[PDB]
């Protein structure tokens, strides 16, 4: 995940 706005990642264990 970004420091301002959203996040976007696939199904796993530790997404950004």
Same mark, same amino acid.
């Given at each position: =995940? &970004? !420091?301002? /706005? %959203? =996040?976007? %990642? !696939? !199904? /796993? &264990?530790? !997404?950004?």
């Amino acid at each position: =995940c &970004f !420091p301002d /706005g %959203r =996040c976007k %990642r !696939p !199904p /796993g &264990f530790s !997404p950004l």
